[PDB]
């Protein structure tokens, strides 16, 4: 494996370093580097394909080597290299190819292909070099074993959920109480409805709460915190929880009173916010809890008295709400998120190539469905699938 | 203290190198596979036309070959046959390392 | 065989010996025995798999020695070692399971695949050594013809039977007499159901006996008796012997009154205990036969006294009941117990590459079906699966 | 760490070899290795304790080696050497304890305490032997990522969990319909009940289900499947869902009709079993899905047929149950089983010397708490802590 | 003693380590220790047996030596070897059995036999050696004076014990409260019962409570409690305290309330768990009791209500329940347990020699009255007794 | 400060360039470069912590140097390294950590730490590189 790393900054510090005209001298650590790679390769055969819409193509060795002792590069040196090189890109795609596809169970997070199985051999590790790929920085640490961990813009954590609780109800869905939200990628909206506007309730407020459990602890969070669901603040037609009828929501937004955001690791609280909106920092947390609650309002002009009657029917609909946005954080298993294109190189290699749906990945690599359950073998595998494509994307793209 | 069979060459390919496929201790296994290389590097064109086979930067000052040529040396000192051997033959050996 | 037993203690008591640190020393009468085998092999061709799901990998050899001598064993020495074992270690897994699915009634207790009857071949032979596996231990004895012997915890004895026998019956099932027990594993409950409770029986006492013919002798068996059937303690409704309606059964329980249990040996009581419950030893028996009686109560204060009426409707089944549990014991065969692996290891090797049910052994190497009809060939090739499973487990778990 | 382990195989291989008589040939390799330890150490200084109620001890080392000069051992020289290795043991002991208690989350897995930050030093590696003690064999393998793997009898798979779910209910709860159970280390007990006795149920057969979801996946495991739910067969005076009354369950037992049990892995059926009694294999699962049925009887004796009538009250609640029991299986990752004691060394310990609470164990190492929520680093530590108390158990039990 | 082990790994260590094939140096360092036993024996005179219809055979020698020369085993090598060592084997089980029969009584801990008396003599010490045999390593820890220590899965603690205690009772036993249990082997099970339900009892609860006292101190023990005591779930016909007479219980189950147990030590609590049910450790007691309550349901259905009227009679007679399993445990003193062999080997030997009952074990080395009358005379000589049943073992099983 | 740039980047391109099995000339500009470096601090004691839940960790220094000889790095140098690193690293963490927390008004733009005050000191500046971060 990381054999396969070098193959590439070996050629997009290669492909890269390598123009008509460079003086010589920084180049002359890259060159050795390179010719040593040739040599334990010329030789050796190997097998590419062999499933779905997969080529099959076959590859073979014997390239000479590069001059030493010149200072300025002609032309003509140029081309008897890119010509060279031009077999390696169109090879390693197709390795990576290869092995993006495979998966296996009780050991789908080692080498599958015929292509790689080869490659991890030992006469081959004569190449490793210049781990600087963000990525393979991250599979070594795992391989020896540590505080791994990777960097995400707006990360893709939350399966995708949107549905309600009726904590009170009644077949004509005329005074209601309970939750809805959206939990979805790095972002939760929730909001409490009660259609009494606490009229019966102790203290005339009323509480809600909304919890959701995160698949993998994020670390070093940097989440936007606002009151209010826009989702969720306007009149909608909703289907019964039993799917038999539907009800009517009509929601008027009141601030959430007594706000109060955990962020729990194991069940113990590590951060915890008190009506904070705007920035706010979650170091380590694998729980987010939002406690708010809806609050009558004791003094009210005519025109909002009028909203809320002591008696039904209940036409406009107490709301309060909230919304979070995980900006960045840090995890130590790789996810999807609004930046990397990983997880869509690997779906896109797939889908191109009519692969095969196989035993650990869900069908089409769908994210809620992988996210949602996301066993110790779906993430060696998305681990090894992503460091492939990380690897891939450093010459294609 | 390796392949106690000495060898046996008909006429395949590489007799020199071979070894390197069947030899446990890599400075042993870097030298064979470098030395059955080297190729003299057939590929210069300098200065306005000049098919000049080139070598290694390497080689060149780089030099270190020699110094892995030496610490692979730096590690052959065992047994096998009668000692007036052993004694003879390492101690040359050093006098190639200092 | 002997040879594949080998393979391994070299591996283990290798890849656990040799690690950085560690002086030569400790491993001289060591490494020396490991290369001995390297020269055996290099040069000689081999084949595996050819069967449902069992790929077919060719090896082909060609390796150097350990000459490296250095007082202490450098990180160095490893590596280029781990690489070389790595290549036996995923070896051997191809060679076990090849073997461990063909089978052969014209005898199997011999090596089958073109892998192993090329291995019993003499110019191999060279290598043997420490015989201390349990297993292989007991194998070598056996293909000497001798007594053999091995260990277990909850052995599994008993094919699996759940059924009743009833001594007096009529077709409304309102005034039955028999027994109904349960076999299974290392376990018997049996009970003993009298619905009259004796009224009519001579000195109001009414027999019952259950006999269980084991497949296998065991000796050393470390056994617990207890009295009661929990098992056939509560009200069940059960099909009928001819399967044509459904009887009740509403047990009251009365302690059994004159246990006696027989441990025999073809046919001569080689212990027998009258009424002891805790544990008790059984030293040498293929049979046991408990013996039991319900006792009317000469004495019954009103509420037992309403139970039992003289005549009919008989609303409360008096029952006696046994409990036993061999927790170990030893048998000259091998067999399934509560905590060896091989059973699981050779059932779930067959079930993983899709092996197709041959001529020894019943269709899910099902446990009831073959200890119910264990012959000398379904024996003979679960010793030579067994113990190949157990050679494996040493390296492969 | 894996210099921890050779500190102790070194002692028992010693106080075990070294007595009395023996002829100095079967010990030369091994007295050896031995000195090699003394030397590496005598100068250094360590610290063990300093936490709750362990005494805080120093150690200094200053002694002499072997006596190769003579034959056959004499009692003299024994006596000389028990003295110096009575303050190894003495030491190890307080070595292992220190370690067993301190946690981390970040970094959990690695070492901790000031006595063996010290010892994975370079400069100690020069020990290391004999690794064929089961836990080390795995930590190993571990640190290189492979197909570990572990052995266990009756393991501890299933949190603790007795409970019920009423599918039809009233307040009278006088006709209802569910299953309860009993999920607890190794074994599940369901029965479903249906106090109608299917009488308006299509085809007159109420379908039940239960469902266990692994916290890990458990691989070549033997089974013990077996009809009827012994803990749910008898007469129950239950609280109801929401705790406000009680309610009575009186079963009458018939046989689960259309058994089928499912070992599934990722959502996918590895194994199944229709109707199959007594020793069954699974060989790799995550999830246990039982499903059985209650048949009305088509035919009934009076007896059987008063039981059930038409219409309420219903008062003999038909019921059908299975058990199944996990008597051995292999686990990647360790767990607590019947015969280890692992789990009681490294609780007993903390226990013996009040040791604090900390951020990644639950209070007093709850085996329930810790496998309901087994995460990574309670695994990693776990493992290091379990690894260290099988090291601790060669010298001291 | 400790003579006696090495006789046998030594040829376990042989008929294991010298098999057709291998080289010399597989076994240089064990040829060695071999020879230089022969030398010691060739020359003395032995007898064995003369008790009960045990044989009485003489034992002379003069055995040549084995070549230290072939660098591989050749055939003709072994069987020249096997012939000389199955007249040792056949030896040493004619010699364990011998002085696995004599008991003493003071001082009755040492040897007996005509045949090991001659044993310990200090000509013959010349022969110890790998002593990593779980037994012998514990066999001279305590000689000299230490902490010795063994490993038992579901260990034999509890002598059978199945009675009941009544707290209330009359002639008619129409109001009965109490309790009745079971302690056998590493279970207890335990019910408290009251037919009035607690209607006058203060707080409308009974307390229960069921104090089991060790024989000897467990350490480091994995523990099973579960609610209920299915083996008292059932209805009985109990015979009365006195004898007289027989009872009915017909038991309805509530879950016990206020569960607590202890596990205690001299008096003094070490653990203490208060309604926990699942897996808990008791790291070292020879006490533990249990404490439990039947709280009278302070809401009813009508089904439940119907059950426990205001008056009598009382028909269904609440109970409550617990279930604790010893599942695995270290005792400093030898005892039965579900795995290990010892017991029965010795008791199995006695009996298939008639041997006559002696002055230290109860008649058929029975373990109820064994454990109930530990005495320090009857564990010094089963000590004795199980370390040569294990010596034994490594041979002939 | 500038100084605590270079010890990362330093392990950075060090952890990274340095695998099991690579060449010499892929790191001469660097094996040298870390070197300099181990020279500098040896002799020279350590300490940081002090402050709530800061563990104060005491650090020492005497280590070897790296073997200029090899061409192709076998896996016995890679070891005999990265036990080497993981001391610096464990290290560091416990410096920056130190440094970044204590604020200051006055004079805040600048160092602060017992552990830092002392690393802008001259005798270190030996040591800056590539500081393309
Ligand atoms: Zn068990």
């Known amino acids: ?397 | 203290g390796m392949q106690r069979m000495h060898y046996r060459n008909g006429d395949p390919q590489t007799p020199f190198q071979i070894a390197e496929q069947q030899i446990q201790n890599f400075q042993v296994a870097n030298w064979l596979h470098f030395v059955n290389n080297n190729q003299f590097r057939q590929v210069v064109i300098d200065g306005v036309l000049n098919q000049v086979l080139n070598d290694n930067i390497r080689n060149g000052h780089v030099i270190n070959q020699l110094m892995e040529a030496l610490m692979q040396l730096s590690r052959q000192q065992f047994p096998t046959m009668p000692v007036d051997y052993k004694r003879s033959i390492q101690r040359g050996i050093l006098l190639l390392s200092n």
């Not at chain 1, 399966?159 to 309600?164: D, K, V």
Request: charged fraction near 20%; aromatic fraction near 10%.
């Open chain 1, 1 to 397: 494996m990381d054999v396969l790393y070098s193959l590439s900054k070996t050629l997009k510090d290669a492909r890269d370093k390598i123009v008509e005209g460079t003086l010589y001298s920084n180049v002359s650590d890259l060159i050795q580097q390179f010719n040593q790679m040739i040599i334990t390769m010329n030789g050796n055969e190997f097998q590419t394909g062999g499933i779905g819409n997969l080529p099959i193509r076959n590859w073979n060795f014997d390239f000479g080597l590069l001059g030493t002792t010149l200072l300025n590069l002609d032309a003509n040196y140029v081309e008897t290299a890119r010509n060279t090189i031009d077999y390696f890109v169109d090879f390693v795609d197709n390795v990576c190819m290869d092995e993006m596809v495979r998966e296996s169970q009780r050991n789908g997070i080692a080498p599958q292909s015929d292509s790689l199985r080869k490659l991890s051999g030992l006469k081959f590790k004569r190449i490793n070099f210049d781990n600087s790929s963000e990525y393979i920085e991250n599979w070594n640490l795992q391989n020896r074993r540590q505080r791994t961990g990777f960097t995400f813009h707006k990360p893709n954590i939350f399966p995708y959920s949107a549905s309600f609780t009726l904590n009170r109800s009644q077949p004509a869905h005329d005074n209601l109480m309970g939750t809805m939200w959206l939990n979805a990628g790095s972002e939760i909206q929730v909001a409490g409805f009660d259609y009494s506007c606490a009229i019966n309730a102790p203290a005339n407020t009323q509480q809600f709460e909304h919890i959701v459990q995160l698949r993998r602890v994020l670390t070093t969070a940097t989440i936007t915190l606002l009151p209010d669901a826009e989702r969720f603040s306007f009149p909608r037609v909703i289907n019964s929880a039993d799917g038999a009828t539907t009800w009517y929501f009509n929601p008027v937004i009141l601030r959430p009173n007594n706000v109060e955001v955990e962020f729990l690791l194991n069940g113990q609280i590590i951060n915890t916010y008190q009506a904070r909106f705007g920035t706010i920092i979650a170091r380590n947390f694998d729980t987010i809890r939002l406690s708010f609650q809806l609050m009558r309002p004791p003094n009210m002009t005519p025109a909002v008295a009028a909203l809320f009657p002591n008696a039904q029917p209940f036409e406009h609909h107490a709301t309060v709400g909230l919304t979070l946005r995980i900006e960045s954080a840090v995890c130590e298993s790789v996810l999807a998120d609004a930046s990397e294109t990983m997880l869509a190189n690997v779906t896109s290699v797939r889908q191109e190539y009519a692969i095969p749906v196989g035993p650990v990945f869900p069908p089409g690599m769908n994210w809620t469905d992988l996210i949602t359950n996301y066993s110790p073998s779906r993430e060696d595998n998305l681990q090894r699938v992503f460091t492939v494509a990380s690897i891939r994307s450093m010459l294609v793209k």
